């Protein structure tokens, strides 16, 4: 017997159940912004790199919903770390550079890097 | 003399004495190595215990990360270095480091080596890419090597500490030491560097109850730390803040202020016998190792003190073109908004006692320093002596020109105009104060706001909150909470009704004459 | 069983030792076991890796491998707390995992695999356990009564009245100038069930005959729920309750078919119910109906497995129908038939003898309604 009315009322396996409650109250664009789906999705991919680079795509698309155009693909929501204020201090654009990349991490983490600078912006 | 600290145990285990503790050099976790043939590895932040690795099943005196292979290097009293992968759990290497038992280990993140201390009276470099094959050979101690630490401005250049009553200054390049320091008199067990890119200092620990401190650069000895009322076992340097830790085998730990060597805390914890000590190099975690355990301890001073008010100086205290005993600083630069804006600094006047807390008033008119249960206040711009006061803690108000203290009697004190307001005065006890223009005080799982008019209590809310911060029309109030935030009307009416009536209970309130509006 | 099997591999290529809960993984055991532990399980170091269509979950202790496989899954931490209880056992018995010495211990970890995982559902163990076992407007003052009631009721064939119960509130809507004192007067009751409730401003008076009720009415509409039994009650339908409909079955067996005929009988003639339908139900091997009845229309439905008679209105009426049915197994015993009724008149007996209202002249008791409702009305 699943599905609760509350938020929780306590231990791992309720909480469990919940994340799954949770995508149904908020289906719309994917998750956007990962519940507690976080903790396991690590290990899904230990072996190393593959994580980061995988981590830096989530990140990337979270930024905003762009034209989408050919190689401008990022979904999730259009706001919700914005982009390009001219007051936000030590703004967004940071974090874009890290995506423009030469190798500056490594190559795995490097080839969804490049895609993902062209992506956002 | 006083110092920004607050001691806190991140995490403890209890295991057979373990010799060295060590903060793994670029991860949260802490390793501290173990007489039970076992070396264990604790993550402090989350309160995980990430592994363990058996080493030997006779003691395991060091411990370290070379963190860049993601293995570990244990020395034990098997002679051995045993290195291990601690994410793919096996043993990554095994080789005989020395032809005794392994008392430190250090690791150099940007060469391959590691150099170990062993009391074999010899320290000796292996080097992990070619499978911990012996580099070097340094022979130079004639003594049972205690500790070795490798020098931040010269990782060729480590410092090995043996009982031998020197600690000899090493480079790799050559065996032998390079230069001898006589550090201590009756032996040294320690040696650490005082961290950073221009600080050429060593310290030594010693069984004659003393730590040392020295120069390396003007070779002297710059002054004796009193350590403890026996043996020292361990000293070592805090990075950030001026202290010096030290660890004895009296199960004592003391703190000492390296401005003056006044103590600062002594520390026990029914654990007992204190053989280590290190230090994070980020700075603020210190780990010292016990006889019956390890813990893991978090060091105060996280967080700076400064208030921006409206004539652009902008006070801090410590810092660049400001002194920390004195006042100073300034901000009248608005590069954009992207970046960190420069110091922009300008010379302020005058101080007397030193800041705890340091702050502008926000409309630029006074300025306060507060310090060791007192107050003292200087003038905006000019900075002479415009007025005193006592607090262990100030805050201003919303009204800036009175004030909340907590005087520490009991009772959450305001005083107005830096003279005490005795028409205020809680029918709570306290515990604790936020400011703002109704007092809020923290006592008996409770938060009680009290009235600026009569000090009866106007309401209590039942979350106890982190701040309270007051509009500057003092009708609507900001709190910060455990809960998240509320914010609350304080209807003036209906406060000036109940306040008069006293309808408001001594220590839960009348429910009416503030609301919650959000 | 979510759980094939509890397993320890060594990466040999075979199942050192292993447990197969109810029989179904023998000789599969071991082939699973012996290709993917050798590979990891397939893994990179990771806890759960997937293969051939198993979940495979493991740790690495040496050569060997301690796994547990799952083709189906109930919850994400469940898998890996079976497995890690697992592994404070296993060093019990074999000082970390080694062939040689698992071998030695089949008995021992095997007992450990049942007690931990039964028939694939994962209880829990611990060294302690295991031991045990290897050991101003009055012109319009106006009043109107509704008392609304639900009447339940389970009956046998024989018309044993089994339970019943009577459910119900009297609302009051009054239009009365100033505030009149209202005196009630109804009927007493009795319930085997028990409840009822009484609005607030309702008084009780002790008189030495008779029952009385006295309150101020909140004006408008609102639950009586006065004293007495109240105005809010659950009475007992057993305590005096009428039960507008009695029904008989008479079932036969024609033979290969069966002939069943219903009777319904209502309270008095003069009265009639509304809304009544009588549901009888069919046996699964149905062929088809043919049913006749006087008043109302009757409709089988297959699905339902139930014959449905409606009756819009009735002063009281009757029944019958002949069923065809393939004769598969042997008799089979018969399930109850419901029914829903409305009637004008409350089944809990409740009669409002009089109330007087005072403060003021005669109002007018424009009208007193009453609804009954079928409950759950179940008769065999």
Known sequence: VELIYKVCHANPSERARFIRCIYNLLQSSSPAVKYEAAGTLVTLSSAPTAIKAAAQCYIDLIIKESDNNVKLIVLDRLVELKEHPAHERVLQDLVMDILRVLSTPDLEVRKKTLQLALDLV | ?518 | ?380
């Open chain 2, 1 to 518: 003399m006083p110092l920004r600290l607050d001691i806190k145990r991140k995490l403890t285990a209890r295991s057979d004495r373990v010799k060295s503790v060590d903060l793994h050099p670029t991860e949260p976790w802490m390793l501290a190595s173990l007489y039970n043939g076992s070396v264990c590895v604790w993550n402090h932040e989350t309160q995980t215990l990430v592994k363990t690795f058996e080493v030997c099943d006779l003691p395991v005196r060091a411990a370290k990360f070379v963190a860049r292979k993601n293995w570990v290097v244990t020395g034990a009293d098997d002679m051995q270095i045993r290195v291990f992968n601690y994410n793919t759990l096996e043993r990554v290497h095994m080789f005989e480091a020395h032809s005794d038992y392994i008392r430190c280990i250090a690791v150099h993140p940007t060469q391959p080596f590691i150099l170990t201390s062993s009391d074999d009276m010899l320290i000796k470099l292996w080097d992990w890419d070619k499978k911990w094959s012996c580099s070097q050979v340094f022979e130079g101690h004639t003594h049972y090597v205690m500790q070795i630490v490798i020098n931040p401005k010269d990782n060729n250049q480590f410092a090995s500490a043996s009982l031998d009553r020197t600690i000899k200054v090493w480079q790799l390049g050559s065996s032998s030491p390079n230069f001898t320091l006589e550090g201590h008199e009756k032996g040294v067990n320690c040696i650490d560097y005082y961290s950073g890119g221009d600080k050429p200092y060593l310290i030594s620990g010693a069984d004659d109850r003393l730590v040392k401190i020295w120069d390396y650069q003007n070779k002297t000895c710059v002054q004796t730390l009193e350590g403890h009322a026996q043996n020292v076992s361990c000293a070592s340097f805090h990075p950030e803040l001026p202290i010096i830790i030290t660890g004895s085998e009296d199960g004592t730990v003391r703190i000492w202020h390296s401005s003056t060597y006044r103590l600062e805390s002594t520390l026990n914890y029914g654990m007992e016998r204190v053989w280590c000590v290190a230090s994070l190099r980020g700075s603020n975690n210190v780990a010292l190792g016990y006889d019956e355990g390890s813990i893991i301890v978090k060091l105060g001073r996280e967080e700076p003190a400064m208030s921006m008010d409206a004539n652009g100086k902008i006070i801090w205290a410590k810092h660049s073109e400001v002194q920390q005993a004195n006042l100073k600083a300034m901000g009248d630069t608005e590069i954009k908004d992207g970046e960190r804006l420069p110091l922009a600094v300008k010379d302020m006047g005058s101080c007397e006692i030193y800041p705890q807390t340091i702050q502008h008033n926000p409309n630029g008119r006074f300025v306060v320093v507060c310090g060791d249960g007192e107050y003292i206040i200087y003038t905006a711009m000019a900075l002479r002596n415009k007025s005193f006061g006592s607090a262990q803690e100030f805050a201003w108000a919303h009204d800036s020109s009175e004030y909340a203290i907590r005087e520490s009697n009991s009772i959450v004190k305001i005083f107005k105009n830096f003279k005490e307001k005795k028409s205020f005065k809680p029918d709570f006890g306290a515990e604790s104060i936020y400011g703002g223009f109704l007092l809020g005080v923290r006592s008996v799982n409770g938060l009680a706001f009290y009235d600026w008019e009569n000090t009866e209590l106007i309401r209590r809310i039942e979350i106890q909150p982190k701040h309270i911060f007051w509009s500057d029309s003092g009708e609507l109030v900001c709190i910060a909470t455990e809960e998240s935030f509320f914010i609350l009307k304080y209807l003036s009416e209906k406060v000036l009704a109940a306040q008069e009536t006293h309808e408001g209970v001594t220590e839960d309130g009348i429910e009416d004459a503030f609301e919650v509006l959000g």
């Open chain 3, 1 to 380: 069983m979510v759980l094939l099997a509890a397993a320890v591999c060594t990466k040999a290529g075979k199942a050192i030792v292993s447990r197969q809960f109810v029989e179904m993984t023998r000789t599969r055991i071991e082939g699973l076991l012996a290709a993917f532990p050798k590979l990891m399980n397939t893994g990179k170091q990771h806890t759960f890796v997937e293969t051939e269509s198993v979940r495979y979950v493991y740790q690495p202790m040496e050569k060997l491998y301690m796994v547990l496989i799952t083709t189906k899954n109930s919850n994400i931490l469940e898998d890996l707390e079976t497995l890690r209880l697992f592994s404070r056992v296993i060093p019990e018995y074999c000082r970390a995992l080694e062939e040689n010495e698992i071998s030695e211990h089949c008995f021992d970890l095997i007992f450990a695999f049942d007690e931990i995982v039964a028939l694939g559902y994962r209880e829990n163990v611990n060294l302690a356990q295991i031991r045990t076992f290897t050991e101003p407007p009055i012109n319009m003052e106006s009043v109107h009564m509704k008392i609304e009631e639900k009447i339940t009721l389970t009956c046998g064939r024989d018309g044993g009245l089994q339970n019943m119960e009577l459910h119900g509130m009297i609302m009051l809507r009054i239009s009365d100038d100033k505030f009149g004192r209202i005196r009630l007067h109804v009927e007493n009751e009795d319930k085997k069930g028990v409840q009822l409730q009484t609005h607030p401003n309702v008084d009780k008076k002790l008189f030495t005959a008779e029952s009385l009720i006295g309150l101020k009415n909140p004006e408008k509409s609102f639950p009586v729920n006065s004293d007495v039994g109240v105005l809010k009650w659950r009475l007992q339908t057993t305590e005096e309750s009428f039960i507008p409909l009695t029904i008989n079955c008479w079932p036969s067996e024609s033979g290969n078919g069966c002939d069943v005929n219903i009777e319904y009988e209502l309270q008095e003639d003069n009265l009639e119910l509304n809304d009544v339908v009588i549901t009888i139900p069919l046996p699964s091997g149905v062929g088809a109906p043919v049913i006749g009845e006087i008043d109302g229309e009757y409709r089988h439905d297959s699905r339902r497995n139930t014959l449905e008679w409606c009756l819009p209105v009735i002063d009281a009426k009757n029944k019958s129908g002949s069923l065809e049915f393939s004769i598969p197994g042997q008799p089979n015993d018969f399930f109850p038939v419901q029914v829903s009724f409305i009637s004008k008149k409350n089944y809990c007996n409740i009669q409002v003898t009089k109330v007087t209202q005072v403060d003021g002249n005669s109002p007018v008791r424009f009208s007193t309604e009453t609804t009954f409702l079928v409950d759950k009305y179940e008769i065999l």
